[PDB]
Amino acid sequence: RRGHTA
Amino acid sequence: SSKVGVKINEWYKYIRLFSVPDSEILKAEVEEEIRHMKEDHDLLLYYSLMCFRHQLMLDYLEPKTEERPKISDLLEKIESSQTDLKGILEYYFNFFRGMYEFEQYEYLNAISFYKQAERKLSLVADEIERAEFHYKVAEIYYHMKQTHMSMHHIVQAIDSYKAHENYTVRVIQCSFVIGLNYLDMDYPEKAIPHFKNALDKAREIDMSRLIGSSLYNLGLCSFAEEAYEKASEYFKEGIRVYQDNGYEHSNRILDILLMLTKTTFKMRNHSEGISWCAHGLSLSKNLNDEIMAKMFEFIHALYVDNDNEKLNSILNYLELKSMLSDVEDLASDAAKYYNEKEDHKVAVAYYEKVLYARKQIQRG
């Protein structure tokens, strides 16, 4: 899953 | 109208600063001025665009849970004034629409809008505003795993932001993007300092959402390093942070739950993995996030009943959503699972899907 980029 | 137009500029400045109290003040001031001037189609569209952008900030800071969301009526109000657009207003129109599409997982629409915004970037004198553009473009390229493109824009953003004062939120977010690009280059030890830096800044400004996200991004590094117990600790604390500070219904909590689920199966705690997977699945369904639900359905179909027809159908779905990195991650999980089980004929098929996804990603 993609990380959090907010 | 120049007077009201300055106020909307001020409004936008406070939004970029994540100062909600100032943003609300400026919002109320602009609405008072509109109720009297009331004679300008462009000024009104600029107003509706900033309303739009303001709500985008609020939805990030406080996710609202049956009623037609405020964001939809604003988006409708904005899509009725598309003819005869020009100048910086046109840049805002395409940039703000791109941001919105990105939040709806409409990745191709979002690039499309961002690219139109990019063309008028020489119209944007404000260096901070250009940093917003570069940060948001870097973000979507990261989600598409266009690592070099992503780094190309993210360095531009963070230098501008680091050159000013009080853009701490965006500096953390840029640190996320930089670190996550290193992780996508298989450099988890190069990513960790960026996330540890972000976590420290996220704690100084006491922003729980960014604290929970830093712990998640750190958990992703441990996971990549196969430090599964530590990754699990990171994922749990990030979940707790989100759940304790009003983000228990943020769609992005599902990422942390998904990775904790994967992590729990990797540690062979079968029953707990199913438990986490089901909780993440239920929450996905309650938050009406079809895309996240599919990923929980994949992990469950992988580790529980080995429903490979369903795995294939989900991988195809995510490809149709232009989410090739998730195709790659999920196909990799299935490849490694069937390899360990010594079902090498099935493992081969998922390795071919991993190779196919990487080629689609490289095709750009």
Short mmCIF file of C-alpha atoms in Angstrom, two decimals:
data_model
loop_
_atom_site.label_atom_id
_atom_site.label_comp_id
_atom_site.label_asym_id
_atom_site.label_seq_id
_atom_site.Cartn_x
_atom_site.Cartn_y
_atom_site.Cartn_z
CA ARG A 1 0.00 0.00 0.00
CA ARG A 2 1.13 3.58 -0.73
CA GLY A 3 2.45 5.56 2.19
CA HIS A 4 0.73 8.62 3.63
CA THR A 5 1.48 11.77 1.68
CA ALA A 6 -1.27 13.90 3.31
CA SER B 1 -13.84 44.20 -6.89
CA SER B 2 -10.08 44.53 -6.29
CA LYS B 3 -10.87 44.93 -2.57
CA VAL B 4 -12.78 41.62 -2.39
CA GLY B 5 -10.20 39.96 -4.63
CA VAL B 6 -7.42 40.89 -2.18
CA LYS B 7 -9.48 39.36 0.64
CA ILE B 8 -9.84 36.07 -1.24
CA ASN B 9 -6.07 36.12 -1.81
CA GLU B 10 -5.60 36.59 1.96
CA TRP B 11 -8.04 33.74 2.60
CA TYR B 12 -5.98 31.44 0.38
CA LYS B 13 -2.77 32.43 2.18
CA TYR B 14 -4.26 31.39 5.54
CA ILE B 15 -5.51 28.10 4.02
CA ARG B 16 -1.99 27.26 2.85
CA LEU B 17 -0.88 28.08 6.40
CA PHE B 18 -3.52 25.71 7.84
CA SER B 19 -4.70 28.55 10.08
CA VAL B 20 -8.36 27.59 10.34
CA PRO B 21 -9.30 30.49 12.65
CA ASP B 22 -7.90 33.04 10.18
CA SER B 23 -9.41 31.18 7.22
CA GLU B 24 -12.84 31.31 8.84
CA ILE B 25 -12.48 34.99 9.62
CA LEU B 26 -11.52 35.72 6.02
CA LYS B 27 -14.29 33.46 4.78
CA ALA B 28 -16.88 35.40 6.78
CA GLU B 29 -15.38 38.72 5.63
CA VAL B 30 -15.54 37.68 1.98
CA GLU B 31 -19.15 36.53 2.29
CA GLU B 32 -20.11 39.87 3.84
CA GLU B 33 -18.43 41.77 0.99
CA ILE B 34 -20.07 39.55 -1.64
CA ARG B 35 -23.54 40.35 -0.29
CA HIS B 36 -23.05 44.01 -1.27
CA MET B 37 -20.82 44.24 -4.36
CA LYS B 38 -22.76 41.36 -5.97
CA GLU B 39 -21.97 42.14 -9.64
CA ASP B 40 -18.98 40.12 -10.93
CA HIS B 41 -19.06 36.66 -12.51
CA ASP B 42 -15.30 36.08 -12.18
CA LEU B 43 -15.02 37.34 -8.61
CA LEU B 44 -17.88 34.97 -7.77
CA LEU B 45 -16.12 32.01 -9.35
CA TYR B 46 -12.92 32.86 -7.46
CA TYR B 47 -15.10 32.95 -4.35
CA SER B 48 -16.61 29.53 -5.11
CA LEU B 49 -13.15 28.15 -5.85
CA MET B 50 -11.83 29.34 -2.48
CA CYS B 51 -14.91 27.98 -0.72
CA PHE B 52 -13.98 24.73 -2.43
CA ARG B 53 -10.34 24.96 -1.35
CA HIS B 54 -11.32 25.97 2.20
CA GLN B 55 -13.55 22.90 2.56
CA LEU B 56 -10.71 20.75 1.22
CA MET B 57 -8.61 21.99 4.17
CA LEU B 58 -11.46 21.40 6.66
CA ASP B 59 -12.13 17.89 5.37
CA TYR B 60 -8.43 17.07 5.84
CA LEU B 61 -8.34 18.50 9.37
CA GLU B 62 -11.77 17.25 10.52
CA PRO B 63 -13.30 14.44 8.42
CA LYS B 64 -17.09 14.78 8.43
CA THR B 65 -19.20 11.61 8.42
CA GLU B 66 -25.95 10.66 5.19
CA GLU B 67 -26.29 14.27 4.03
CA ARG B 68 -25.05 15.56 0.66
CA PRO B 69 -21.51 16.72 1.56
CA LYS B 70 -20.78 20.43 1.39
CA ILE B 71 -17.98 19.62 -1.09
CA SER B 72 -20.46 18.35 -3.71
CA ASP B 73 -22.67 21.44 -3.80
CA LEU B 74 -19.52 23.60 -4.02
CA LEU B 75 -18.15 21.44 -6.84
CA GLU B 76 -21.46 21.74 -8.70
CA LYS B 77 -21.43 25.53 -8.19
CA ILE B 78 -17.92 25.59 -9.60
CA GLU B 79 -18.48 23.39 -12.68
CA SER B 80 -21.19 25.73 -14.05
CA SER B 81 -18.72 28.57 -14.80
CA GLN B 82 -16.16 26.90 -17.08
CA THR B 83 -16.57 28.96 -20.27
CA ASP B 84 -14.29 31.91 -21.06
CA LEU B 85 -11.77 31.15 -18.33
CA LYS B 86 -8.38 32.86 -18.39
CA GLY B 87 -5.42 33.92 -16.29
CA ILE B 88 -4.71 32.88 -12.72
CA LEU B 89 -8.37 32.04 -12.14
CA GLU B 90 -8.04 29.32 -14.79
CA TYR B 91 -4.92 27.99 -13.08
CA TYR B 92 -6.83 27.80 -9.78
CA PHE B 93 -9.78 26.12 -11.46
CA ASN B 94 -7.66 23.29 -12.87
CA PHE B 95 -5.43 23.02 -9.78
CA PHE B 96 -8.31 22.85 -7.27
CA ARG B 97 -10.23 20.42 -9.47
CA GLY B 98 -7.10 18.27 -9.70
CA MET B 99 -6.80 18.19 -5.91
CA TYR B 100 -10.44 17.17 -5.59
CA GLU B 101 -10.13 14.38 -8.16
CA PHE B 102 -7.02 13.10 -6.37
CA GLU B 103 -9.04 12.84 -3.12
CA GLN B 104 -11.66 10.78 -4.99
CA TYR B 105 -9.07 8.28 -6.30
CA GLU B 106 -9.71 9.68 -9.83
CA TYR B 107 -6.04 9.58 -10.66
CA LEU B 108 -6.18 10.05 -14.44
CA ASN B 109 -8.56 13.04 -14.14
CA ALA B 110 -6.26 14.49 -11.48
CA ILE B 111 -3.12 14.33 -13.64
CA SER B 112 -5.18 15.77 -16.46
CA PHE B 113 -6.21 18.76 -14.34
CA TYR B 114 -2.74 19.21 -12.83
CA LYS B 115 -1.16 19.22 -16.29
CA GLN B 116 -3.52 22.00 -17.43
CA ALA B 117 -2.58 23.96 -14.28
CA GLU B 118 1.12 23.36 -15.03
CA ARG B 119 0.83 25.28 -18.33
CA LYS B 120 -0.03 28.55 -16.58
CA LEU B 121 2.58 28.21 -13.86
CA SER B 122 4.47 31.25 -15.19
CA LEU B 123 1.32 33.20 -14.14
CA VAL B 124 1.95 32.32 -10.49
CA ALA B 125 4.36 34.88 -9.07
CA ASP B 126 3.91 33.68 -5.49
CA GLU B 127 6.70 31.21 -4.67
CA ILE B 128 4.63 29.57 -1.93
CA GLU B 129 1.75 29.00 -4.31
CA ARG B 130 4.11 27.37 -6.79
CA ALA B 131 5.33 25.16 -3.92
CA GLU B 132 1.76 24.01 -3.36
CA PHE B 133 1.59 23.08 -7.01
CA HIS B 134 4.89 21.18 -6.94
CA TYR B 135 4.02 19.40 -3.68
CA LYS B 136 0.64 18.25 -4.99
CA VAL B 137 2.14 17.16 -8.33
CA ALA B 138 4.88 15.26 -6.52
CA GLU B 139 2.22 13.55 -4.41
CA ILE B 140 0.22 12.14 -7.30
CA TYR B 141 3.37 11.05 -9.10
CA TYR B 142 4.39 9.18 -5.97
CA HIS B 143 0.99 7.44 -5.83
CA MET B 144 1.59 6.47 -9.48
CA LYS B 145 5.12 5.35 -8.48
CA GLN B 146 6.68 7.81 -10.92
CA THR B 147 9.58 8.13 -8.54
CA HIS B 148 11.86 10.38 -10.58
CA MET B 149 9.07 12.73 -11.62
CA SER B 150 7.93 12.80 -8.00
CA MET B 151 11.38 13.69 -6.63
CA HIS B 152 11.77 16.31 -9.37
CA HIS B 153 8.77 18.22 -8.11
CA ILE B 154 9.11 17.50 -4.39
CA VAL B 155 12.58 19.06 -4.14
CA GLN B 156 11.24 22.24 -5.72
CA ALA B 157 8.42 22.33 -3.16
CA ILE B 158 10.38 21.73 0.00
CA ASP B 159 13.06 24.34 -0.80
CA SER B 160 10.41 27.02 -1.25
CA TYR B 161 8.60 25.89 1.92
CA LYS B 162 11.82 25.57 3.94
CA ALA B 163 12.71 29.09 2.82
CA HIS B 164 9.63 30.52 4.56
CA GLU B 165 8.27 30.42 8.08
CA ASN B 166 5.24 28.50 9.39
CA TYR B 167 4.73 26.08 6.50
CA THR B 168 5.48 23.30 8.91
CA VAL B 169 2.57 21.12 7.87
CA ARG B 170 3.69 21.17 4.24
CA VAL B 171 7.32 20.61 5.24
CA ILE B 172 6.25 17.43 7.06
CA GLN B 173 4.19 16.38 4.07
CA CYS B 174 7.16 16.93 1.73
CA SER B 175 9.27 14.80 4.07
CA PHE B 176 6.63 12.09 3.65
CA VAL B 177 6.96 12.25 -0.13
CA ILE B 178 10.78 12.26 -0.15
CA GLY B 179 11.01 9.38 2.31
CA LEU B 180 8.35 7.37 0.49
CA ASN B 181 10.19 7.76 -2.83
CA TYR B 182 13.36 6.35 -1.22
CA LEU B 183 11.27 3.46 0.09
CA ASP B 184 10.06 2.84 -3.47
CA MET B 185 13.74 2.71 -4.48
CA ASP B 186 14.29 -0.07 -1.88
CA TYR B 187 16.20 2.29 0.46
CA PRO B 188 14.24 1.96 3.73
CA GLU B 189 17.26 3.14 5.72
CA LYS B 190 17.34 6.29 3.55
CA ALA B 191 13.59 6.86 4.12
CA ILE B 192 13.57 6.50 7.92
CA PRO B 193 15.38 9.81 8.75
CA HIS B 194 12.83 11.76 6.73
CA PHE B 195 9.93 10.11 8.59
CA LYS B 196 11.65 10.47 12.00
CA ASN B 197 12.17 14.17 11.20
CA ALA B 198 8.49 14.46 10.24
CA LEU B 199 7.39 12.67 13.42
CA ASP B 200 9.37 15.08 15.58
CA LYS B 201 7.87 18.09 13.81
CA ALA B 202 4.42 16.50 13.90
CA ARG B 203 4.72 16.16 17.69
CA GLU B 204 6.03 19.72 18.21
CA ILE B 205 2.97 21.21 16.48
CA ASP B 206 0.80 18.52 18.13
CA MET B 207 -0.94 17.45 14.92
CA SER B 208 -2.26 13.94 15.58
CA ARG B 209 -3.06 13.21 11.93
CA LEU B 210 0.56 13.86 10.94
CA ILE B 211 1.82 11.92 13.98
CA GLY B 212 -0.24 8.89 12.99
CA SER B 213 0.93 9.18 9.38
CA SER B 214 4.61 9.39 10.35
CA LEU B 215 4.26 6.20 12.43
CA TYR B 216 2.54 4.52 9.47
CA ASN B 217 5.26 5.60 7.05
CA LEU B 218 7.86 4.31 9.56
CA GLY B 219 5.95 1.05 9.85
CA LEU B 220 6.24 0.73 6.09
CA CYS B 221 10.06 0.88 6.42
CA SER B 222 10.21 -1.85 9.07
CA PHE B 223 7.84 -3.90 6.92
CA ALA B 224 10.16 -3.54 3.93
CA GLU B 225 13.02 -4.59 6.22
CA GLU B 226 10.97 -7.59 7.34
CA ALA B 227 11.05 -6.28 10.90
CA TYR B 228 7.45 -7.36 11.12
CA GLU B 229 7.01 -7.08 14.88
CA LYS B 230 8.33 -3.52 14.84
CA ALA B 231 6.21 -2.68 11.77
CA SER B 232 3.20 -4.07 13.66
CA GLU B 233 3.98 -1.79 16.63
CA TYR B 234 4.21 1.21 14.33
CA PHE B 235 0.93 0.36 12.61
CA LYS B 236 -0.93 -0.15 15.89
CA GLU B 237 0.23 3.10 17.47
CA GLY B 238 -0.61 5.02 14.29
CA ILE B 239 -4.10 3.52 14.32
CA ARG B 240 -4.47 4.47 18.01
CA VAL B 241 -3.30 8.01 17.28
CA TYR B 242 -5.91 8.34 14.50
CA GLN B 243 -8.65 6.74 16.59
CA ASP B 244 -7.97 8.84 19.70
CA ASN B 245 -7.98 12.27 18.01
CA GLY B 246 -11.04 12.25 15.74
CA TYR B 247 -9.69 10.41 12.68
CA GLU B 248 -11.30 7.01 13.34
CA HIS B 249 -13.37 7.60 10.17
CA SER B 250 -10.62 9.01 7.99
CA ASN B 251 -10.42 6.82 4.88
CA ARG B 252 -6.63 6.92 5.24
CA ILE B 253 -6.76 4.98 8.51
CA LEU B 254 -7.59 2.05 6.17
CA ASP B 255 -4.00 2.09 4.83
CA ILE B 256 -2.65 1.47 8.33
CA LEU B 257 -5.19 -1.28 9.01
CA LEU B 258 -4.37 -2.91 5.69
CA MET B 259 -0.63 -2.97 6.38
CA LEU B 260 -1.21 -4.20 9.96
CA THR B 261 -3.34 -6.99 8.52
CA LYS B 262 -0.61 -7.97 6.02
CA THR B 263 1.87 -7.69 8.84
CA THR B 264 -0.13 -9.96 11.11
CA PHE B 265 -0.31 -12.68 8.43
CA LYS B 266 3.44 -12.32 7.78
CA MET B 267 4.00 -13.18 11.46
CA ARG B 268 1.73 -16.21 10.87
CA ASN B 269 -0.85 -15.10 13.44
CA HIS B 270 -3.59 -16.48 11.25
CA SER B 271 -6.61 -15.81 13.44
CA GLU B 272 -5.53 -12.27 14.31
CA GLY B 273 -4.86 -11.54 10.66
CA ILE B 274 -8.42 -12.53 9.79
CA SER B 275 -9.70 -10.45 12.68
CA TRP B 276 -7.81 -7.33 11.54
CA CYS B 277 -8.73 -7.96 7.91
CA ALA B 278 -12.43 -8.20 8.75
CA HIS B 279 -12.33 -5.02 10.87
CA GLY B 280 -10.58 -3.19 8.06
CA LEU B 281 -13.07 -4.60 5.54
CA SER B 282 -16.08 -3.55 7.66
CA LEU B 283 -14.69 -0.03 8.14
CA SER B 284 -13.94 0.24 4.41
CA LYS B 285 -17.58 -0.64 3.72
CA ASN B 286 -18.88 1.79 6.34
CA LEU B 287 -16.71 4.59 4.91
CA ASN B 288 -18.01 3.69 1.43
CA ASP B 289 -14.43 3.16 0.16
CA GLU B 290 -14.78 0.51 -2.53
CA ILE B 291 -11.10 0.66 -3.47
CA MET B 292 -9.86 0.01 0.07
CA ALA B 293 -12.48 -2.74 0.50
CA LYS B 294 -11.06 -4.56 -2.52
CA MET B 295 -7.60 -4.59 -0.98
CA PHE B 296 -8.88 -6.17 2.23
CA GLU B 297 -10.85 -8.64 0.11
CA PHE B 298 -7.60 -9.51 -1.71
CA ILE B 299 -5.58 -10.22 1.45
CA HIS B 300 -8.43 -12.33 2.85
CA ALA B 301 -8.85 -14.21 -0.42
CA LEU B 302 -5.08 -14.75 -0.46
CA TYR B 303 -4.34 -16.00 3.06
CA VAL B 304 -7.69 -17.53 4.02
CA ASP B 305 -9.32 -19.46 1.18
CA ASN B 306 -6.82 -19.03 -1.70
CA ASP B 307 -9.49 -17.70 -4.08
CA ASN B 308 -7.19 -16.95 -7.02
CA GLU B 309 -10.03 -16.10 -9.40
CA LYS B 310 -10.92 -13.37 -6.95
CA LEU B 311 -7.29 -12.31 -6.62
CA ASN B 312 -7.10 -11.97 -10.39
CA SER B 313 -10.34 -10.00 -10.60
CA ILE B 314 -9.18 -7.59 -7.92
CA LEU B 315 -5.79 -7.07 -9.60
CA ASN B 316 -7.56 -6.26 -12.86
CA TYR B 317 -9.87 -3.85 -11.04
CA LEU B 318 -6.99 -1.92 -9.45
CA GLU B 319 -5.32 -1.69 -12.86
CA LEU B 320 -8.51 -0.18 -14.25
CA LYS B 321 -8.25 2.31 -11.38
CA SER B 322 -4.73 3.23 -12.55
CA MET B 323 -3.39 1.97 -9.22
CA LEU B 324 -0.52 -0.05 -10.56
CA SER B 325 1.61 0.15 -7.44
CA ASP B 326 -1.09 -1.64 -5.46
CA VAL B 327 -1.36 -4.17 -8.27
CA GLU B 328 2.37 -4.70 -7.85
CA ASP B 329 2.28 -4.87 -4.05
CA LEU B 330 -0.71 -7.23 -3.93
CA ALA B 331 0.58 -9.51 -6.74
CA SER B 332 3.89 -9.62 -4.87
CA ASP B 333 2.10 -10.79 -1.71
CA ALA B 334 0.39 -13.59 -3.64
CA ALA B 335 3.64 -14.55 -5.43
CA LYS B 336 5.58 -14.81 -2.17
CA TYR B 337 2.72 -16.64 -0.38
CA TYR B 338 2.38 -19.30 -3.09
CA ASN B 339 6.17 -19.60 -3.32
CA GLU B 340 6.53 -20.30 0.41
CA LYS B 341 3.68 -22.81 0.17
CA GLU B 342 5.72 -24.42 -2.64
CA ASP B 343 2.81 -23.94 -5.08
CA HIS B 344 5.33 -22.75 -7.61
CA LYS B 345 3.08 -22.94 -10.67
CA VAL B 346 0.69 -20.44 -9.05
CA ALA B 347 3.57 -18.37 -7.65
CA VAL B 348 4.95 -17.99 -11.19
CA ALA B 349 1.66 -16.49 -12.38
CA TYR B 350 1.70 -13.81 -9.74
CA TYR B 351 5.35 -13.03 -10.41
CA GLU B 352 4.34 -12.44 -14.03
CA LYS B 353 1.67 -10.05 -12.78
CA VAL B 354 4.30 -8.26 -10.68
CA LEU B 355 6.51 -7.97 -13.77
CA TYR B 356 3.56 -6.80 -15.85
CA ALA B 357 2.70 -4.09 -13.31
CA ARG B 358 6.29 -2.83 -13.11
CA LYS B 359 6.36 -2.57 -16.91
CA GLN B 360 3.10 -0.62 -16.92
CA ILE B 361 4.61 1.67 -14.29
CA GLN B 362 7.83 2.18 -16.30
CA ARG B 363 5.78 2.95 -19.43
CA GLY B 364 4.71 6.20 -17.68
#
